[PDB]
Design a protein around this nucleic acid. Structure first.
Ligand SMILES: Nc1ncnc2c1ncn2[C@@H]1O[C@H](COP(=O)(O)OP(=O)(O)NP(=O)(O)O)[C@@H](O)[C@H]1O
Ligand SMILES: [Zn+2]
Length: 748
DNA sequence: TAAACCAGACCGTC
């Protein structure tokens, strides 16, 4: 009636729907002694924390930083990440208490957690070293004190952009004695957002070199293929990489699971949801600490409900919690604390827990479908694993062509190294914005470089635009305006819809948040919102004021709605015809229609009703490049053509971010069989950004190279006929690669 | 697919 973790592994190993088993060997610690040049109080505080010797990567980090070489360390989960930058910083401040340090954290939550850990170690040390967070949530009263009292300042790239750099005169104390700059999640600063952050760091560099201090960069990265490369491109300093993980590891089983078949003629497999519910059932009933990742928020709530209902009989009510970003802050801090301290047995989470928050180590990880990227899969996997014991990671594939491809061909996943991080810090829009901010902070000499090389031409352009005035060889700010306040480092942002519960008007409370775009389908005027298994019904969605008023009624079902997406070219402004195709660049609009939502019983998963959603067709206006296929009378069948269009779309989504150095999400590639304005099959590439940010323009400009590199990728892909790294394994004839390549020929 | 962020200081009225 009680099975151990190893016994449960044995049961899984045999006679199952398992399709692959991958054993990751245990790794015993590799270590060096604590450098006894360290302050004795620091050694004692670390000895209390079980840190008597250092790991190889921690030691290498310390020595590298001690000599002044900038580092980027790839410290996995529970591998002593924090100490790599905490030891140099605390050492150097304990040496000369006039020293200071910047911590750059991608979120405010991680900033608060780092402040907490630093405060604990500082209290154990006994020296009056103050570490403050200066994010947006810092109340304006304490900000003045923090500027001139905080030895360690913990912020965002965002808050570095908007407040610290432009008021560098109010941060004198910090800037004159800046020895270290910590960047905690290098990989999250990629794509266009990384392009912005790069120029933010350039402005930080110029302020530092002005105030008389050249600090050294300590970066932490996830497992991306180019960590040193992204680190150098982002910091602009020579980066030396810390690869060798010297932390203790345990046996790790990484298993591919495929639901059984329930109707072979129609070839429908069981829900990955049901198999995951039952697997987490078996693991949590035996009190095994388990993380269960789900691809969407709704599936997170569904799996939470099912798992809790099936396991409450044996384990209890309060042992299993959910996790998604729309939760309240206090809620998420408590769930993190509970996963850490060991009083939460199971957690069902969105990808929000791929982010390196400290929830400790899990024993079992369950993936309800392939996350969508190799790096995300490996991140979800690294969330489980004891220091010495065993660990198990089950990836229950679903009915996705990509997931079933991983299942039919498991070597494909384990040979692909995780994705690369690409930024273009010389995007015209981004570089111009940040030049304006930098000039506002300090007058910029024309001959002096900004990152790569001289930028005097853009400075002439800026003087022409009444914004800069040129005195001598330096351009001064020539406008009463404040540039950094109207520039958003992640302008693909939004106001969020606040979820308010007017049940009793005596105690009306905010129960959560949700991005405006998602509220169209998850918080419509009769939606059901599930907040950690708690049922609410949206009474009314105030779209204009970003509010969703709900009540706590108890029903049997849950709502799901889908968005019909459209794309309409407004006007073509640049175009180039060819022998068989035509390539245009112009303005397009993407339209999202809420249409109707469906009611589905939670227990049976059967449709029990439908309803309308009366919301506006929300349209995004942006720029796009697109390719029209010219057809004669001798033309391909429509649906063979459509499948070929989908293949070309996949190949383009792979090649374009590589060529124009941006992220895969910075540009979408949509296929249309009969475009509305021409009737001709078309491939659209539009960057999803309110203002056209020039990705589609560069796609149009360098499109021939993109095309031929696409052909190159198709021919040098190791698969038979097709895989999800090229034409996407969903064309329904033989020799699909050849047809795709021929279409690429007619485009070239 | 989910998720994330944004002057310092003064002014005029409660
Ligand atoms: N030299 C050491 N000896 C013993 N334990 C150590 C040592 N260095 C680090 N640790 C342990 O490391 C644990 C947490 O590591 P940490 O510095 O937080 O990186 P991390 O867990 O990988 N960050 P994350 O990837 O977001 O989870 C603590 O519980 C420490 O006890
Ligand atoms: Zn392939």
């Amino acid at each position: 009636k009680k099975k151990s973790l190893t016994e449960l592994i044995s049961d899984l190993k045999g006679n199952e729907n398992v399709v692959n088993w991958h054993e990751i060997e245990p790794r015993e610690a590799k270590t060096r002694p604590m450098p006894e040049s360290i302050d004795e109080r620091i050694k004692a505080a670390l000895s209390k924390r079980g840190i008597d010797e250092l790991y190889t990567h921690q030691y290498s980090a310390f020595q590298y930083v001690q000599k002044g070489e900038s580092i980027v360390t790839v410290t996995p989960t529970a591998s002593g990440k924090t100490l790599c930058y905490n030891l140099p910083v605390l050492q150097s401040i304990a040496q000369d208490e006039t020293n200071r340090a910047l911590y750059l954290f991608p979120t405010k939550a991680l900033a608060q957690d780092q402040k907490s850990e630093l405060n604990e170690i500082i209290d154990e040390m006994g020296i009056d070293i103050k570490s403050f967070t200066y994010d947006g949530d810092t109340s304006p009263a304490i900000r003045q004190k923090v500027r001139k009292a905080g030895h360690i300042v913990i912020t965002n790239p965002d808050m570095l952009h908007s407040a610290i750099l432009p008021h560098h005169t109010k941060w004198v104390s910090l800037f004159e004695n800046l020895k270290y700059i910590v960047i905690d999640e290098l990989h999250t600063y990629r794509g266009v957002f990384g392009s912005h952050v790069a120029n933010v760091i350039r402005r930080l560099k110029r302020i530092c070199r002005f105030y008389g201090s050249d600090p050294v960069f300590i970066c932490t990265s996830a497992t991306i293929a180019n960590p040193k490369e992204l680190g150098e491109q982002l910091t602009g300093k020579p980066m030396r990489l810390v690869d060798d993980n010297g932390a203790p590891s345990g046996r790790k089983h990484f298993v591919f699971y495929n639901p059984p078949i329930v109707n072979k003629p129609l070839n429908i497999r069981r829900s990955a949801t049901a198999e995951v519910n039952e697997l987490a059932k078996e693991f949590l009933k035996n009190k095994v600490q388990t993380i269960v990742f789900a691809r969407s928020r709704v599936r997170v709530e569904i799996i939470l409900s099912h798992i809790q209902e099936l396991v409450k009989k044996e384990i209890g009510t309060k042992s299993i919690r959910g996790y998604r970003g729309g939760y309240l802050p206090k809620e998420r801090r408590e769930i993190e604390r509970g996963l850490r301290e060991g009083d939460i047995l199971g957690v069902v989470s969105t990808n929000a827990l791929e982010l390196g928050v400290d929830i400790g180590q899990l024993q079992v990880c369950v993936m309800t479908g392939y996350p969508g990227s190799v790096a995300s899969a490996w991140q979800q996997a690294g969330r489980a694993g004891r220091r010495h014991g065993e660990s198990l990671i089950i990836m229950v594939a679903n009915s996705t062509p990509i997931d079933q491809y991983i299942v039919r061909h498991p070597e494909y996943f384990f040979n692909r190294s995780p994705e690369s991080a690409r930024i273009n810090p010389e995007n015209l829009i981004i570089l111009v914005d940040h030049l304006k901010c930098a000039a506002y902070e300090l007058p910029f000499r024309a001959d002096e470089e900004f990152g790569a090389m001289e930028v005097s031409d853009i400075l002439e352009y800026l003087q022409e635009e009444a914004v800069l005035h040129r005195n001598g060889e330096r351009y001064h700010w020539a406008s009463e305006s404040f540039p950094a306040s109207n520039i958003s480092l992640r302008s693909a942002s939004q106001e969020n819809v606040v979820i308010v519960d007017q049940s009793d008007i005596a105690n009306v409370r905010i129960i959560g948040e949700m991005d405006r775009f998602s509220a169209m389908t998850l918080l419509h005027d009769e939606a059901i919102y599930l907040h950690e298994g708690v049922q609410y019904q949206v009474e009314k969605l105030d779209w204009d004021h970003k509010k969703a008023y709900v009540r706590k009624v108890d029903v049997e079902y849950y709502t799901d709605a889908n968005l019909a997406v459209q794309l309409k070219v407004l006007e073509i402004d640049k175009t180039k015809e060819k022998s068989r195709t035509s390539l245009h660049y112009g303005d397009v609009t993407v339209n999202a229609l809420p249409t109707i939502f469906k009611k589905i019983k939670m227990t049976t998963f059967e449709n029990i009703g439908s309803g309308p959603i009366h919301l506006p067709e929300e349209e995004l206006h942006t720029s796009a490049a697109w390719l029209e296929i010219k057809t004669a009378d001798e033309d391909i069948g429509e649906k063979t053509l459509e499948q070929l269009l989908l293949g070309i779309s996949n190949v383009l989504q792979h090649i374009v971010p590589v060529y124009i150095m941006c992220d895969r999400n910075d540009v979408h590639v949509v296929s249309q069989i009969k475009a509305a304005h021409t009737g001709l099959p078309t491939i659209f590439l539009y960057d999803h950004y309110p203002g056209g940010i020039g990705l589609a323009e560069e796609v149009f400009k360098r499109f021939s190279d993109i095309n031929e590199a696409a052909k190159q990728l198709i021919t040098h892909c190791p698969c038979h006929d097709g895989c999800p790294s090229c034409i996407g394994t969903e064309i329904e004839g033989i020799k699909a690669k050849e047809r795709i390549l021929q279409l690429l020929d007619q485009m070239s």
